[PDB]
Structure formats: C-alpha cells, structure tokens
Design a protein around this ligand. Sequence first.
Ligand SMILES: Cc1c(C#Cc2cnc3cnc(-c4ccc(N)cc4)cn23)cccc1C(=O)Nc1cc(C(C)C)cc(N2CCN(C)CC2)c1
Length: 282
Amino acid sequence: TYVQHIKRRDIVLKRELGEGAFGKVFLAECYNLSPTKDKMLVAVKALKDPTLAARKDFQREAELLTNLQHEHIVKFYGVCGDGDPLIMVFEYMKHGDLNKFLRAHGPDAGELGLSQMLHIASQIASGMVYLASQHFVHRDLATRNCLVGANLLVKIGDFGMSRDVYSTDYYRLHTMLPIRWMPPESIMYRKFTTESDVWSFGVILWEIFTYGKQPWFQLSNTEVIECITQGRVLERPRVCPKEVYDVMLGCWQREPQQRLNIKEIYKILHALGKATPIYLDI
Ligand SMILES: Cc1c(C#Cc2cnc3cnc(-c4ccc(N)cc4)cn23)cccc1C(=O)Nc1cc(C(C)C)cc(N2CCN(C)CC2)c1
C-alpha cells in the first residue's frame, strides 16, 4: 500500500521516551499534519543506521499500520522518506503505556473503579474484535503494549521488548517470548491464533484487576512454563468480581476451541457494566 509521506523538516523533537529493538521513540511536534497545518504533538520512532532486517521490519510495520485502522488500534500518521534515521510518526498518547498507568493507580503507589476497569478491558476487547476481523494475530497482547490517551482512551499497539530498560516479561524458550501471557499450545507448539490472543486477553483482564502486577510474579520463568503446561491458572484477584473472573476462565480453557471468542467477550464485558460508557461519532 501507499504510506503517507511526512517531511523531515516538519518534525521537531521535544523529548526522548524510550528505546526498543526498532530505535528511539520521541515526543515531538509535527507541522503541516493537522487540517490547520498548525503544529501538533506526535510520537516519533527513529531508527538510526538500520540493518537490512530493521529496514524490512520498518516497512512491514508501516504497511500493517496503514492497513489496520480502528478506534482502538494505535493511530499511525506516516513515515519520512528514505534516509537516516528512518522515521515513523504516531499519534501521541499522553498517558503512556497501560501497564505503568495501571501501576500508578494501584495500592503500591486515586484508584480505578470497576466501571473504569471494565471500560479499559472493553476497549482492548474492541480493538481485538477488529484485529480478529482482519485475521491478524498479535502474539504479544499485554497491558505494556497498550497506550492510554485522554478520557481513558485505550488503544492496542506493539512495542516489543525494551532496549534500554531491564525487563522480566520475556524469556528465551532464537526469540524472546512473553511466556506469562501465553497459552499452553503457544508455549509448547508455537501455535499462535486468535484463540491464543484470547488467552492473552484473559491475562490482560488479570493485569487490569491487579493494577498491572506481573502474572505469575511469584514464579521463575522455568516455573511459569511448567505451571502453564500443567494447566494451573492465575488466581482470582480479591477485588475481582466473580463474573469478571469467570470471563478470565472462559479465556483460559485448555482446548483452544472451547475458549470464548473475543466477540463473545466484548458482549459480556458490556453487559457486566452497570453504566457502560456511550460511544459517539457525532
Ligand atoms: C505505537 C507504537 C509506537 C508508539 C507510540 C506513542 C505515542 N504516544 C506514546 C506515549 N508513550 C509511549 C511509551 C512510553 C514508554 C513505553 N515503555 C511505551 C510506550 C509511546 N507513545 C512506537 C513503536 C511502535 C508502535 C506500534 O505499536 N507499532 C505496531 C503496531 C502494530 C499493531 C497492528 C498492533 C503492529 C506492529 N508489528 C511490528 C512488530 N510486531 C512484532 C509485529 C507487528 C507494530
């Protein structure tokens, strides 16, 4: 597909946010982008001196995000031309990643109410309904890969593992894998499907209702693999309503075809809310 072309001259970097496998991410301003062409905040990913593999991954990401557009998928504005660094431009989400957001509202840090937790969950589920409709399998759904904007707006992205910060969330089972978020068939057989994404969503629900705590925090990586392989599941958080835990269990059926599908999950989460927010388009 064609990707929108942003001029390098129109981007002004303001602050560095982090670095992944695919280069540094910055808060920036961009001109000539908004309908008024007035400057607007964006996030910029910059890849310096990219290898061939990095260039290919950059192109794959740009094409994917041009094609996958939805209210709850991270919004992508375009790329700069060929050169160094390679630059990709995203919508700025001012509250950052959902895992840090959840932790900032947790007891170990006011707090988030049931309505707010369900709204976060429902928005992620909505994004996943869209991904499933495009036959896109994400493989790394987790709150660390979701962004939070104004009005508790949550969108799904994929940032990968941190380049500069120590992380406990990935383990080399080749490739680093988010094993704590994965079902038995993904760990044992590398089978990744919409159904393994549903498993991960159940783990996201657990993250939300524990304010971002790491799944299986009490277990080493080796113990996690054995635990998941042997069919143990995450325990119900004390502040988690039984109905919400029952949705998690619906995600965590050992047989993938017995799991709730994400459309079913979306409907349930929406019925579970006492006063589900109303979505408008004007
Ligand atoms: C949004 C984003 C960005 C960004 C951003 C942005 C805008 N505002 C903020 C605010 N905070 C952050 C922030 C700060 C700290 C930390 N730890 C995480 C995020 C990022 N922001 C950077 C790199 C990659 C992406 C991104 O999600 N790329 C993406 C998305 C998708 C969708 C279809 C799920 C797919 C892909 N793929 C590429 C790689 N993947 C393995 C397979 C597919 C890449």
